[PDB]
Enzyme design. Structure first.
Site, PDB file in Angstrom:
ATOM      1  N   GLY A  17     -11.946   6.036  -6.182  1.00 54.17           N
ATOM      2  CA  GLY A  17     -11.007   6.527  -7.181  1.00 54.17           C
ATOM      3  C   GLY A  17     -11.669   7.481  -8.168  1.00 54.17           C
ATOM      4  N   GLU A  18     -10.913   7.944  -9.156  1.00 55.23           N
ATOM      5  CA  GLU A  18     -11.487   8.927 -10.078  1.00 55.23           C
ATOM      6  C   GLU A  18     -12.523   8.294 -10.990  1.00 55.23           C
ATOM      7  OE1 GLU A  18      -8.888  10.638 -12.898  1.00 55.23           O
ATOM      8  OE2 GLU A  18      -7.728   8.829 -13.286  1.00 55.23           O
ATOM      9  N   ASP A 135       5.182   2.078  -6.843  1.00 49.42           N
ATOM     10  CA  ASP A 135       4.335   3.064  -6.191  1.00 49.42           C
ATOM     11  C   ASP A 135       4.112   2.733  -4.731  1.00 49.42           C
ATOM     12  OD1 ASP A 135       2.674   5.442  -6.178  1.00 49.42           O
ATOM     13  OD2 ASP A 135       0.936   4.314  -6.851  1.00 49.42           O
ATOM     14  N   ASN A 140      -1.410   2.660  -0.420  1.00 50.47           N
ATOM     15  CA  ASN A 140      -1.382   1.440  -1.270  1.00 50.47           C
ATOM     16  C   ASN A 140      -1.135   0.205  -0.460  1.00 50.47           C
ATOM     17  OD1 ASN A 140      -1.961   2.952  -3.502  1.00 50.47           O
ATOM     18  ND2 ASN A 140       0.093   2.946  -4.354  1.00 50.47           N
ATOM     19  N   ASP A 154      -2.342  -2.013  -3.859  1.00 51.25           N
ATOM     20  CA  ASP A 154      -2.524  -1.362  -5.182  1.00 51.25           C
ATOM     21  C   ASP A 154      -1.309  -1.770  -6.018  1.00 51.25           C
ATOM     22  OD1 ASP A 154      -2.332   0.732  -7.285  1.00 51.25           O
ATOM     23  OD2 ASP A 154      -3.952   1.621  -6.124  1.00 51.25           O
TER      24      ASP A 154
HETATM   25  C1  LIG Z   1     -13.283   0.281  11.899  1.00 55.29           C
HETATM   26  N1  LIG Z   1     -12.956   0.284  10.461  1.00 55.29           N
HETATM   27  C2  LIG Z   1     -14.034  -0.304   9.623  1.00 55.29           C
HETATM   28  C3  LIG Z   1     -13.697  -0.181   8.122  1.00 55.29           C
HETATM   29  C4  LIG Z   1     -12.284  -0.723   7.832  1.00 55.29           C
HETATM   30  N2  LIG Z   1     -11.889  -0.564   6.426  1.00 55.29           N
HETATM   31  C5  LIG Z   1     -11.367  -1.512   5.596  1.00 55.29           C
HETATM   32  C6  LIG Z   1     -11.152  -0.902   4.399  1.00 55.29           C
HETATM   33  C7  LIG Z   1     -10.612  -1.510   3.220  1.00 55.29           C
HETATM   34  C8  LIG Z   1     -10.399  -1.009   1.964  1.00 55.29           C
HETATM   35  C9  LIG Z   1      -9.807  -2.075   1.195  1.00 55.29           C
HETATM   36  C10 LIG Z   1      -9.342  -2.265  -0.140  1.00 55.29           C
HETATM   37  C11 LIG Z   1      -8.790  -3.541  -0.462  1.00 55.29           C
HETATM   38  C12 LIG Z   1      -8.716  -4.548   0.519  1.00 55.29           C
HETATM   39  N3  LIG Z   1      -9.178  -4.415   1.766  1.00 55.29           N
HETATM   40  C13 LIG Z   1      -9.682  -3.203   2.058  1.00 55.29           C
HETATM   41  N4  LIG Z   1     -10.169  -2.831   3.273  1.00 55.29           N
HETATM   42  C14 LIG Z   1      -8.374  -3.854  -1.829  1.00 55.29           C
HETATM   43  O1  LIG Z   1      -8.046  -5.008  -2.119  1.00 55.29           O
HETATM   44  N5  LIG Z   1      -8.390  -2.845  -2.714  1.00 55.29           N
HETATM   45  C15 LIG Z   1      -8.086  -3.106  -4.087  1.00 55.29           C
HETATM   46  C16 LIG Z   1      -8.970  -3.871  -4.865  1.00 55.29           C
HETATM   47 CL1  LIG Z   1     -10.430  -4.443  -4.217  1.00 55.29          CL
HETATM   48  C17 LIG Z   1      -8.651  -4.164  -6.220  1.00 55.29           C
HETATM   49  C18 LIG Z   1      -7.464  -3.682  -6.777  1.00 55.29           C
HETATM   50  C19 LIG Z   1      -6.594  -2.919  -5.992  1.00 55.29           C
HETATM   51  C20 LIG Z   1      -6.897  -2.626  -4.655  1.00 55.29           C
HETATM   52 CL2  LIG Z   1      -5.765  -1.720  -3.721  1.00 55.29          CL
HETATM   53  C21 LIG Z   1      -8.468  -1.460  -2.246  1.00 55.29           C
HETATM   54  N6  LIG Z   1      -9.426  -1.293  -1.160  1.00 55.29           N
HETATM   55  C22 LIG Z   1      -9.870   0.057  -0.827  1.00 55.29           C
HETATM   56  C23 LIG Z   1     -11.563   0.458   4.563  1.00 55.29           C
HETATM   57  N7  LIG Z   1     -12.028   0.663   5.803  1.00 55.29           N
HETATM   58  C24 LIG Z   1     -11.218  -0.095   8.741  1.00 55.29           C
HETATM   59  C25 LIG Z   1     -11.634  -0.331  10.203  1.00 55.29           C
END
Ligand code: A1A1R
Ligand code: CL
Ligand code: CL
Ligand code: CL
Ligand code: CL
Ligand code: CL
Ligand code: CL
Ligand code: CL
Ligand code: CL
Ligand code: CL
Ligand code: CL
Ligand code: CL
Ligand code: CL
Ligand code: CL
Ligand code: NA
Length: 265
Positions: A17-18, A135, A140, A154
């Site tokens: 993110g930013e 959103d 998300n 998100d």
């Molecule tokens: C082959 N390949 C290997 C790599 C794999 N891969 C999995 C992810 C991934 C990102 C992510 C998450 C979250 C949860 N699980 C995730 N998984 C998540 O809970 N996020 C979050 C959090 Cl931590 C706190 C507040 C809001 C949010 Cl939206 C956002 N991020 C970016 C990226 N690539 C895809 C298959």
């Protein structure tokens, strides 16, 4: 000697993110893998703090649902705020759609119905808790593969269902009534955004942010979809983008819809 460094080992960057980033981490004491977002901590007492704290509260009240990414903890360090969630091994829906776009193989009708039903159950829960998401979009939503599960991740625009002030979500997915500051039917803005999310997953071109094509959609016209879908499924997607919000299905009506009866697990 921060909590983040002492209790977790970072494995791989998985989002950005930013004002920070998300890492896949292993927690040293329990051996399990988590996604942890670390962001600049806003000023004490500021509006940005209020906004950041609302987002924490939304994770803490919504993350137990099966179609919201699960919450474990959130904390502040000196200059950072951290949120620890489940790690969804399939990554974002936006990245899955981007790969599908490249290879010319999109979500098929049955898989689109599964996406619509699963995110629809997430929204039916959010709306039953007197909240709106504000959103919904592919970047998300996250995927867990084992049968596939889609989860809203998100929560940074979540606000209560009768809020008189709203932070608008992504303009590509934003319903016109919210743009015009009419907040009488906020749940139906999430329905509108979810329909366009499904259109993206069906193979459409990137959606417009503004302009003539943006206005055309807000008259209730679906973007071109590059694959044959059934007429009744297409008609469901169209009525979810109806210019009159009251004509759009509630999330409850959506999950009970006869078209999605086959998708139900
Ligand atoms: C082959 N390949 C290997 C790599 C794999 N891969 C999995 C992810 C991934 C990102 C992510 C998450 C979250 C949860 N699980 C995730 N998984 C998540 O809970 N996020 C979050 C959090 Cl931590 C706190 C507040 C809001 C949010 Cl939206 C956002 N991020 C970016 C990226 N690539 C895809 C298959
Ligand atoms: Cl910890
Ligand atoms: Cl990244
Ligand atoms: Cl859960
Ligand atoms: Cl810090
Ligand atoms: Cl993986
Ligand atoms: Cl449900
Ligand atoms: Cl997106
Ligand atoms: Cl985005
Ligand atoms: Cl309006
Ligand atoms: Cl409503
Ligand atoms: Cl798009
Ligand atoms: Cl249409
Ligand atoms: Cl049909
Ligand atoms: Na959950």
């Amino acid at each position: 000697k921060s909590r983040y460094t002492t209790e977790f080992h970072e494995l791989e960057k998985i989002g950005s993110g930013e004002f920070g980033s998300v890492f896949k981490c292993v927690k040293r004491l329990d051996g399990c893998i988590y996604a942890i977002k670390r962001s600049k901590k806003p000023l004490a007492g500021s509006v940005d703090e209020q906004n950041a704290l609302r987002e924490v509260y939304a994770h803490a009240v919504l993350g137990q649902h099966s179609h919201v990414v699960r919450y474990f903890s959130a904390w502040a360090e000196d200059d950072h705020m951290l949120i620890q969630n489940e790690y969804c091994n399939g990554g974002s829906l936006a990245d899955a759609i981007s790969e599908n776009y490249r290879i010319m193989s999109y979500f098929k009708e049955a898989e689109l119905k599964d996406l619509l039903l699963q995110v629809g159950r997430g929204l039916r829960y959010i709306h039953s808790m007197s909240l709106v998401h504000m959103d919904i979009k592919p970047s998300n939503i996250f995927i867990s593969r084992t049968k596939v599960m889609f989860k809203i991740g998100d929560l940074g625009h979540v606000t209560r269902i009768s809020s008189p002030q709203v932070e608008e979500g992504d303009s590509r997915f934003l319903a016109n009534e919210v743009l015009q500051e009419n907040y009488t039917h906020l749940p139906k803005a999430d329905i509108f955004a979810l329909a366009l999310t499904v259109v993206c997953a069906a193979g459409a071109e990137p959606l417009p942010r503004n302009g003539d094509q943006w206005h055309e959609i807000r008259q209730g016209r679906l973007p071109r979809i590059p694959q044959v879908l059934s007429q009744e499924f297409t008609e469901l997607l169209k009525v979810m983008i109806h210019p009159d919000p009251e004509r759009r299905p509630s999330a409850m009506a959506l999950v009970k819809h006869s078209v999605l009866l086959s998708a139900s697990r």
